[PDB]
Design an enzyme around this catalytic site. Sequence first.
Site, PDB file in Angstrom:
ATOM      1  CD  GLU A  26      -3.220  -0.959   1.977  1.00 61.92           C
ATOM      2  OE1 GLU A  26      -2.920  -0.517   3.081  1.00 61.92           O
ATOM      3  OE2 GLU A  26      -4.400  -1.253   1.633  1.00 61.92           O
ATOM      4  CD  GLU A  41      -4.818  -5.211   3.230  1.00 58.36           C
ATOM      5  OE1 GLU A  41      -3.604  -5.159   2.907  1.00 58.36           O
ATOM      6  OE2 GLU A  41      -5.383  -4.388   4.006  1.00 58.36           O
TER       7      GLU A  41
END
Lengths: 479, 472
Positions: free
Chosen positions: A181, A376
């Site tokens: 991320e 995710e």
Amino acid sequence: AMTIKGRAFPEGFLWGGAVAAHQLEGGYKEGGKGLSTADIMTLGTNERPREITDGVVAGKYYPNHQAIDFYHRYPEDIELFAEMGFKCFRTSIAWTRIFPNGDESEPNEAGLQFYDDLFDECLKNGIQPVVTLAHFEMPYHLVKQYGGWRNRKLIQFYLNFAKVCFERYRDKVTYWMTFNEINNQTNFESDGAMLTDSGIIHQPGENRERWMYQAAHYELVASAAAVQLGHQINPDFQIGCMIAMCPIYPLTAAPADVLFAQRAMQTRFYFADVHCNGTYPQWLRNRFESEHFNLDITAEDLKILQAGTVDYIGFSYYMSFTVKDTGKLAYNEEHDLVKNPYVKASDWGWQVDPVGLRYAMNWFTDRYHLPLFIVENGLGAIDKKTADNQIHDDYRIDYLTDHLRQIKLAVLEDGVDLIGYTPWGCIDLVAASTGQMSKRYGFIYVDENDDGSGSLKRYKKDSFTWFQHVIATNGAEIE
Amino acid sequence: TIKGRAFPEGFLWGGAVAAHQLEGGYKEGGKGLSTADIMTLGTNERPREITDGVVAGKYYPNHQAIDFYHRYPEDIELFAEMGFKCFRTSIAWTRIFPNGDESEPNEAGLQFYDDLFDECLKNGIQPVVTLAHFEMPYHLVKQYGGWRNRKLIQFYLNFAKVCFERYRDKVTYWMTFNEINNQTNFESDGAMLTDSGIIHQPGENRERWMYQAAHYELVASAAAVQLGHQINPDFQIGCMIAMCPIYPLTAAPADVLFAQRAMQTRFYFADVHCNGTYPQWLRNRFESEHFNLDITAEDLKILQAGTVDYIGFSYYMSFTVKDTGKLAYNEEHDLVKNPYVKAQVDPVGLRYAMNWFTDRYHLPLFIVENGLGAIDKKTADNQIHDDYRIDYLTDHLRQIKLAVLEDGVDLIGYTPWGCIDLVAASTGQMSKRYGFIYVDENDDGSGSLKRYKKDSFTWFQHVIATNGAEIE
Ligand SMILES: [Cl-]
Ligand SMILES: [Cl-]
Ligand SMILES: [Cl-]
Ligand SMILES: [Cl-]
């Protein structure tokens, strides 16, 4: 007329589950392991932010020290994963187990041996490891001594770490990702995002925006160099970026709202633009000049960036954002997001937007034309274990179903190229936001309380069974 | 701020037209009958009649137009006074190949464009040429079924080859198919005729035949990029896209997804022109609708090697959509009003569209149509006070200026539509005017055809002579 029930996902689809070292492993000191930025984060609540302390302060509780003690229990946990029929296991290699302080000239053999053992355990069970190098667990030494990714030296410290891992594990892992991320620091005002992504704790007088872009640049260069280095060690290696994919809608069709939302997506996903196109978008280069950031960007940097673009785009998905036009030039994520009144409470109370995932998958495909990996996605909720030791978590089954429906449409109808799908926190782990065990994502219930007490015993949730069946049918029944 | 900052050195300011909308001389020099030459006069609430060849008793406004065929010296005089750097027009396919399937080109049509282009070049004005611009030979429509037929690929290539060779030292920028994506609206008979030479046959699946015809056009475009690059490797060969961006009405996720798909449908042409392959969602559609299109492996190899050097586009308006419930975008039925735009003119969408093209394709752009159609009135002292037109063009240029100087979009130039008043495409009327130059022609064709400068003429003259630096 058109239906998706009865139709399987593609052959070779990698069903699995996802975790990060610092959130499950524990043994935070075992085997000469270094203090990570995850290890200085205290327990918080929904109301109370986690405390970042300078080292391990006395009489404070750090939930990542033990977590669920997967460092020691992984054979039991992996057997549960193989019983579900996992094709892969997405996790991180703790930077602090391989280079405890991050600047040593040689790796840590005890740490390298742990991942040998963990990966050998997965592989005898039909499960290939999918490995993220940087995942919010960098050596705190690097933050204290170098100022984190303010400093160009972290590019070589990172590459030392990647090199050693690439070579040690080169017959064991096919799928790698560089920086988890990487685009959370889009919100440059978020102390949590600056620490996790870039190991930045603000200093007085600093332009927060400027140093995020400096820090992101070095990481993007490090990522690109790691793709090349990586491909040199094993040409079969698939090396990807990792993007938090919160799509940003215009609130209304007002042209200025629609343009502003374009600029928010541009701002939030320039990282993906560099990872994939090999160059900085021109609007952002123009921003660098007009704000006089004077960034340390070399011609060498740019050549590395252009040769080291990624093999696939791994991403997370949880939610969508909305914006209206502020009157302002730049998107500031901390202040510019508005409520989306068209998204309401689901049957279970929480808001979701499974449609945005389909939208997001088309947005990545049409922009980059690369394979994607959903690494995710998940529901964090309270679970009760009944007297007869079961967890009837059909709120989690529904959540995953609603999302899987849209993913199934994106792949079968829209033709998006998806490597796989690994729901987050497949085994209950320490939650990033609060450090609570109580906020649970797993298919596997771990009998641990927020204060770290409890037996730590694993129990199957009902979602465990539902997901086993999905893998066993390659998603055919999803309608 | 942008006030006092010029557009980039060498920005191609100019004006755009299409041969059939202004030339006239429709039978001159052995010129064949075009699809424009079989369209009668219509109004706002009355489609242009399509007829089978020229019928007596009917008026056809493109036959005469404004007589630029004989008046180009006077008219180019006005463009040069305005200070144009380029002149964007089409080479009339029926002047080079009257029926379309001849083995040799027509020498007199070729010499017309020599004369026209030399007239432009002696005044510092470089021609910018679109090869197909809604004016294909009616022989091809009638006898082959237009772009339903694979044979048109070669016909187009014979046309393209000849034009590249003849004008090799005289034209740098080329475009293959004008507004190729109007036929997104497959229910639009005008779009189907103008883009693809398709007059509907009952029984026919409209959407299917659109995709088939558009395929062959994309293949011909791909193949002509390669051919032109072989003939003059310094040629820039672009596509031409009608850029109507499509907004979701609300932030409702279903409205946002639908707007994505609406734009995927309308701009896949661009995807193929630039990425060189079909998007997988659409290929899947071909399969699930059972189009069984004629698409060979060879087609896919040409497409991939023939991607364009730049994207030319028109910009007039934006659209809005909400979720219908349906799987597919239908542009004839699925548009709703944007309640956030003044009563759909939308300058900010231009800026949006420029970023969209740029972030998706990373190719240089060229704005080859933009302008305001209005009823202009000539005063007793022979002035045209088109302050509304200056306001429109300023609002758009300001957005173009931000896109280029701040957003770093790579823009080759800017040529507003109908720089000299011409026959409108929608209706065949003269009275819907776009020009910097007013032409004294009524909709029945009568009048002096005399030319007068509108106020916008002097305004755009000053925009060019300062290279846009006063635009704020
Ligand atoms: Cl949401
Ligand atoms: Cl964390
Ligand atoms: Cl859709
Ligand atoms: Cl895009």
